[PDB]
Amino acid sequence: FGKKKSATAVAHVKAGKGLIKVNGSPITLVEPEILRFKVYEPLLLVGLDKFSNIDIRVRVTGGGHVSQVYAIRQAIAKGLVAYHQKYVDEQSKNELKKAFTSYDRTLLIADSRRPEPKKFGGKGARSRFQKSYR
Amino acid sequence: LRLLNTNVDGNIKIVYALTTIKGVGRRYSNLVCKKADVDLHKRAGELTQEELERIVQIMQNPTHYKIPAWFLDGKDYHTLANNVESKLRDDLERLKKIRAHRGIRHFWGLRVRGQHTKTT
Amino acid sequence: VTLAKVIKVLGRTGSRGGVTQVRVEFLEDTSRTIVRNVKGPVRENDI
Amino acid sequence: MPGVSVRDVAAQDFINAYASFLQRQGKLEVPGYVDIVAEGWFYKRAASVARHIYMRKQVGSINRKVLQALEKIGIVEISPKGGRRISENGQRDLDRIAAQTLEEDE
Amino acid sequence: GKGSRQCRVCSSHTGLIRKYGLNICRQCFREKANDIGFN
Amino acid sequence: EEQEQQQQQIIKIRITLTSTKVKQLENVSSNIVKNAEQHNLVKKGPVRLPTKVLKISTRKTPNGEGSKTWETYEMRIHKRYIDLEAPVQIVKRITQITIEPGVDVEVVVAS
Amino acid sequence: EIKLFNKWSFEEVEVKDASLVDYVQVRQPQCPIIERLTNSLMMNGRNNGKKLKAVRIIKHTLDIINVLTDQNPIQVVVDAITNTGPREDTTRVGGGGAARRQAVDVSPLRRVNQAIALLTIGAREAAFRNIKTIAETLAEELINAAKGSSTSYAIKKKDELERVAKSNR
Amino acid sequence: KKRKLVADGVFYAELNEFFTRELAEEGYSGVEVRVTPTKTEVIIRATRTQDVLGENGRRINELTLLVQKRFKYAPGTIVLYAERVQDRGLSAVAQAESMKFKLLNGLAIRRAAYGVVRYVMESGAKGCEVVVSGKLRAARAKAMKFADGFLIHSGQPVNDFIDTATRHVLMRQGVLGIKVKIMRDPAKS
Amino acid sequence: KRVFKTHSYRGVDLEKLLEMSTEDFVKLAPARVRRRFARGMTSKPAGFMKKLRAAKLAAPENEKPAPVRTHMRNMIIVPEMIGSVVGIYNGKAFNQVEIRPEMLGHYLGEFSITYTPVRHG
RNA sequence: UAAUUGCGAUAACGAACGAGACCUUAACCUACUAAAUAGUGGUGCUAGCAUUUGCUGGUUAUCCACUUCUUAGAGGGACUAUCGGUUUCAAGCCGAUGGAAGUUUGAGGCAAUAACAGGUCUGUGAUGCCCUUAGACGUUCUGGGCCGCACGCGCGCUACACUGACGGAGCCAGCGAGUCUAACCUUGGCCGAGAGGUCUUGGUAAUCUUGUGAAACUCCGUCGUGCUGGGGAUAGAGCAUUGUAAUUAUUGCUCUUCAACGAGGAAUUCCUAGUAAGCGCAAGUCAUCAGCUUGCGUUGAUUACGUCCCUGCCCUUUGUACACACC
C-alpha cells in the first residue's frame, strides 16, 4: 500500500500463519541485503507490542533497489495497522502504530521527495555546466 | 623461465607471463596455454617441462606452425611473437612503396586512419 | 562570542563554571556553557 | 517463516549446476568449448537459464541454444508462449534439487 | 536519399524536424504554437 | 490481472473519441454517455487512455549568441473510448451522433 | 536512511567530555540526531560518491575495530570522535593587509564534524597501511585513534590545529 | 498520434497562409475547419465577406476549389463558407490589417495609427496598444507606441484577453511592421 | 577449435593470398579477383575499362604504357587490369600512376594524394 | 520581505501595469465517477514438490468488487495551521507540535518600463538599397574541401587504480519513440565465436518491441598496490554492417601492440538536497554517427550564526562636461 521515492510496495492483509513472503519470497531472504534488516525490522520492530502476529504478506515493485527495499518497509507495518478490525487490531490499533512509529519513518508515512526537474544548463537540476569564457 | 627465442619470461602464473611473451596475449594465454592440458591454475617457475615443451607446442607450435592444436594444401594463417616488430616493418613496408594516403603516412609520420589531427 | 563573566560556584564545588557568549566582529546572541579553561574577558570567543 | 519452494536465492543456482556438471549426463556437450571468455566453467550458465523458469514461462549464441541442453532434460519447453516452460521434470526436477539444497544448508 | 529533404515552409534544407515533418524551428519557433503546438 | 490494463479490451461498438482539448470537446463525453443512459445497452465505456503528451523542444533564437536559451514546447493528445453496445439489434442514428469539432470519432462495432 | 544495528550493540551512554553529548548523537544548531554519529562515520565514508558498501565498510570497520582489543566498538567510535576534535583554531584576520588569524571555538557540532570527516580523511588517505582493508585504515587510525587515543597516532593534525592556535593568537 | 496535431500543423496553419494572403483584399480574420463523414468544412471568417464570398458566386468555388486541389484531397470532401467577422475591434488582424493597409494606403503614420488605437478602444474594449516599429520616414531606425486601457502581458493564462499579432508593412523604403494588441473580454462569454 | 579464430595475422593472406599465384589472374580469376575480403561488391560491374582494354593495349607498341584517365576514385584495386596507367585525379590533378599487379592494394583514387602538402614541420 | 513585498512615516490621498495572484507541471486524498483490474483476493482447468496447505507457478473459462496498485476526469487539501517565543506598534522572523505537504510547498512559464547601433539578409516566396547575367556569384553535374598539423586558448571523454580492475553470478528504473509501401519499432526459431545473417511475428492509446537483460550497484571467487591483471593511446592484420559510393578518415566485431599518465602548477569552474556528486537509457541528430546536447530515472554526501573582505550588481547623496549623454 506504500510507495517510496519513485518505488511502490503493495499490502496483503487477512489473518493466517507464518512465512510472510515479499514479492514472492520470504523476509528471511530479501537479498539486496546488507541492510537487509529495516525490512525484517518492521516485523522485528513489532518489538513494542506484538511478537509477529499470525497474518499476511504482499509483493512490491517499482523504481530500483534500495528504493524498493525502503518501500516493502512501510508496506508491512503500513498494513499491520490495516483499518482494522480484521487487520490492525479490532480495537485501539494505536497499539502498534504510535509505537511502530515512535521510532519510524517507513510506516511513519512517506517522504515528500521525488525525482524530476533539470535545467537549460549543464547536467541540469542545479549543477549547471562549467564554463569560463575569457 | 625462458621461452620462445630471446623471450625470457617468468615469476608470474601460467598463461599470464606468457603474455610478456612478446606476441602472446589475454586469450592466447588461455586457449593456447590451456589446451595444453596445462593446469591454468599453475604458476611461475613451477610448470611441467612436459608442459613448457608442449606449452611451446600448443601455445607456441599451435601458437606456432599450426594453431592446429599440436598434431595432425596448407595455407593457412599464423601469428607472430618475438618475430613481431620485424614483420610489422615488413607490412608497413608492403605499404611503404605503392604509397597510401594512410600508408606513406607511416613514413611521413601522420596518424594512419581517421585521426582529425590538428590538435593531437 | 567573547566569553562573558565567570560566575563559578563557591570554592572546590564546581567541575567548572559557565560562560555566556555572542560575538563582536561577527555575530551577537545570548549563551553560556561548554568550556573549562580559565581565561577571561581578556580572552574571547567566535561566531 | 519461512521457506523458498523453487526459491532460496543464489546458492540455489550454485546448486542445480553444482549438481548438473557434477552429477553430469549431460546434454551440455557444448562445443563452444573453451574459446568464449572466464573459468571452470558454465553449467552455472544453465543454472541461470534454469531459474529462468520463474519468468519466460510467464515473466549470446552460447546462450542461443544453451537452451538446447535444458530442453533435452531439465525442463525448458518449446513454449507455445515462444520461449521455454519448465517442462515435465518441472518446478520439480528443480523444485527437488532446491529441496535438497534446502536441507543441505544443514 | 539522405541529408536533403527540404522543410515545407522555406525550403531551408537545414534544421528540419521529427514528429511533424516541416520546420525548421526557423519557421516554427513562433509560427506553429497555434498551428498548432500549444505550450 | 497484471497490466496497467491493456487497452483494450475495447468496446462496445468501439466508439473511441480521441482529441486534443477537454471541456470544449470532451464535454461530448458526458454527451454520448448520458445520451444512452436512456434505454441504451449497458455502457461499460468511459475509458480514459492516459494523457498523451507530444513535446517538441528546440533551443531559442535563430543564430549564435545567447546561451541559446532553449525552450521546449508541448501539444498534448488526450484520447478516450466508450463502450456503448456490441453490435446491438438496435443501431443506426445511434450510429455516429453529436459533433464537437476537434475530437475524432470511432466506429467498428464488434465482434 | 539507512544502516543497521546489533553486531555488538555496545551502547556506552557515558563517555562524552566537554559539551558533545548534548550533541553526541545529534546535528541541529543543523540536523537532529543523524543516527548516533555512526550514521555519519558510515556516511563521511562516501568519498567516491555513493553509500552502501560504504555501509559494509562501516560494519566491517566495526567488527574489526573492536574484535581487535574491544572497547565496545561503538564507544571506540564515540571515544574515537571523542578525544579527537579540534578546539579553537584560528580563522583569518583582515586586520592588516595581509592578515594574521586569531582563534576560538569550535561550535561543538564543529568539534564533532571537523574531526569526523577528518578521521574519515586520514583513513581514506591509506598510503599507510596501504593494505587492502579500507575499513582497516578506517578502523586502525580510528583504532589508532582509540589506542591512538593514547598518542598519537593517526589524527595528529588534531593537535596541530590547536597546538598552533596558541602562538599566532 | 500520426495526424492529429501533425494534421493541424498540417492543413491548419498551412491553410491559414492562403487564408492570410490571396484574400486580404477582403480582410481575413482567421479560419476553422472540421468534417462530418468526409465533410471537410472551411469556415473563413471575413471582415468584408461579400464578393469576397461570392461575386455572382465565383469567390468560393474559385478559391474553395483551389483550396481543394491545392492541399490535395477533397474532390468533394473539402467545402468552404463565409462567416461574418466579429465586431472588428480585436482578433489582432482587424485594425492591424487596417494600419497594415493604412500607412500603406497613405495616411501619416502619426495619427494614422492614433486611429486604430482610438477605434478598437472605441468599439469598447478597455483600451489597446499597437506600436509602429519601422524605419520612421527617411532616417535611421526606431519605434513608437500607442495604447491606453489595461493588460500587461503577464501570466493571465494565455494572457486571457490580450489578443495581439503582428503583420508585414512592406513600404517602398523598407519594412516597418505593424503590431496591435487588444484588452479583449472585459469579462463576457 | 583448436584456434583458427584470430591470432595476430593471417590466413594464407597478403603472403599466400592475392599473391596466391602471382600469375593467378594471369589466367583469371575474374570474380575470383575478389578472393579476399573485406570489401566488394554488391553489383558487378562497370564499363569504362574498355579503354584500358582494347586501347591501352591494342599495340604493342612493345614500349608498354598508355594514357587512360578517369575520375573514379571509386574503381577498386583491379586487378584484372594488372598493369597500365590511369588518371588518378585530386580535383585539378588526374595524376599519373602505373597499375602494377605487385600491389592490388587500395582504391584507384587512393594511391594519389589530395593533401600533398603536409606543410612545414 | 524574494519583491516599491508590507508595515510604518506622512501633505498627501487614494489607485492601474510590473512582483503577486494564475498557468503548468511534481507530490496527498474521496470510501465521487469504471477500469481490465497491480488482484487488493478469491472462483474453475492445470503443472509441479509438500499430513489443511502453505510454496509455488502457469491458463483460457464465469464471476465479483473495490485499496493496492493504474489511467484521468471532478472536487477536496495549506491558510505560517496550533501553541509558545518576540519585535511590541503591528507586517513578520523564529522554535516546538505536526500535517502529503511549513511560512518562499519543489520546480518551471509567463516577465512592465527603458536601454544596445548588441547577434541574426547564411532560416523564409520577409524586405531598402548595392552587386551580379547564354566565359553567370543563378541552378545544376564530377571531383576534392571544410577533417589538411611546428604550436596556442576553450567545452569535454576516460584514466592514474585495493571503496579497485577482473570473471560468475543476484533485480529493477523512469521519461520516450516507431510503419501502409520499404531497409518504422522489433519480439520470438534457426545459423553466427563476434559483429551480424536471418526465417517468420506483434504492433497507427495504455495492446506489440522497451521496465523481462539500463548501468552504477550486492554477493562469490582471481589478481597482489609491482606504470600488474589500472588504464588503453598508436598501429598490424583480418570479418561484417550503413549507403550509388566508404581509399580520402569512415560504423561494430576478432586476435596482437601496448604509450602517456604515480592525483595536476599560477589560475579558475559549479553548486545548499527527490541537492552536489557519481551511474546509466530516451529523444533531437539519422542511411550509417554520438566523446554533444535537451531530458529521464538509479545510488546517494559533507556544508552555515553567515556577511564580514575581495567580484558584481543595486538605492540613496554628492559632485559634476555634458546630454546623441565618458565609445
PDB file of C-alpha atoms (C1' of nucleotides) in Angstrom, chain G residues 29 43-45 47-53 107 113 117 126-127 130-134, chain J residues 96 162-164 216-219 224-225 276-278 299-305 309:
ATOM      1  CA  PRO G  29      22.303  24.008  15.680  1.00  0.00           C
ATOM      2  CA  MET G  43      28.330   8.467   5.761  1.00  0.00           C
ATOM      3  CA  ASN G  44      31.521  10.533   5.709  1.00  0.00           C
ATOM      4  CA  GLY G  45      32.682   7.351   4.062  1.00  0.00           C
ATOM      5  CA  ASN G  47      34.078   9.799  -0.710  1.00  0.00           C
ATOM      6  CA  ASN G  48      33.846   8.131  -4.162  1.00  0.00           C
ATOM      7  CA  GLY G  49      30.217   9.149  -4.438  1.00  0.00           C
ATOM      8  CA  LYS G  50      27.756   6.504  -3.140  1.00  0.00           C
ATOM      9  CA  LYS G  51      26.797   4.881   0.171  1.00  0.00           C
ATOM     10  CA  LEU G  52      26.329   1.169   0.831  1.00  0.00           C
ATOM     11  CA  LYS G  53      29.460  -0.940   0.639  1.00  0.00           C
ATOM     12  CA  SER G 107      30.869  25.331  17.717  1.00  0.00           C
ATOM     13  CA  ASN G 113      32.129  17.255  12.483  1.00  0.00           C
ATOM     14  CA  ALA G 117      35.203  13.897   8.106  1.00  0.00           C
ATOM     15  CA  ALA G 126      45.642   4.947   3.040  1.00  0.00           C
ATOM     16  CA  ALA G 127      49.300   5.005   1.937  1.00  0.00           C
ATOM     17  CA  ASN G 130      48.439   0.854   2.058  1.00  0.00           C
ATOM     18  CA  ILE G 131      46.893  -2.576   2.600  1.00  0.00           C
ATOM     19  CA  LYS G 132      43.551  -3.509   1.114  1.00  0.00           C
ATOM     20  CA  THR G 133      41.420  -3.022   4.200  1.00  0.00           C
ATOM     21  CA  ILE G 134      39.648   0.306   3.697  1.00  0.00           C
TER      22      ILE G 134
ATOM     23  C1'   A J  96       8.418  23.459  19.190  1.00  0.00           C
ATOM     24  C1'   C J 162      42.753  -2.475  -3.213  1.00  0.00           C
ATOM     25  C1'   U J 163      35.992   1.991  -1.885  1.00  0.00           C
ATOM     26  C1'   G J 164      39.873  -1.261  -7.371  1.00  0.00           C
ATOM     27  C1'   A J 216      26.473   2.457 -11.324  1.00  0.00           C
ATOM     28  C1'   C J 217      25.332  -1.124  -7.725  1.00  0.00           C
ATOM     29  C1'   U J 218      25.126  -6.716  -3.908  1.00  0.00           C
ATOM     30  C1'   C J 219      27.290 -11.389  -3.474  1.00  0.00           C
ATOM     31  C1'   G J 224      48.796  -8.752  -5.228  1.00  0.00           C
ATOM     32  C1'   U J 225      49.499  -1.556  -4.525  1.00  0.00           C
ATOM     33  C1'   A J 276      26.209  18.060  -5.394  1.00  0.00           C
ATOM     34  C1'   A J 277      28.243  14.252  -6.845  1.00  0.00           C
ATOM     35  C1'   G J 278      28.674   9.502  -9.247  1.00  0.00           C
ATOM     36  C1'   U J 299      22.818   5.143  -5.781  1.00  0.00           C
ATOM     37  C1'   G J 300      23.111   8.758  -2.926  1.00  0.00           C
ATOM     38  C1'   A J 301      27.403  13.458   0.984  1.00  0.00           C
ATOM     39  C1'   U J 302      29.861  16.728   3.526  1.00  0.00           C
ATOM     40  C1'   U J 303      28.100  22.257   4.473  1.00  0.00           C
ATOM     41  C1'   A J 304      26.230  27.759   7.645  1.00  0.00           C
ATOM     42  C1'   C J 305      25.387  32.173  13.115  1.00  0.00           C
ATOM     43  C1'   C J 309      36.593  41.421   2.959  1.00  0.00           C
TER      44        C J 309
END
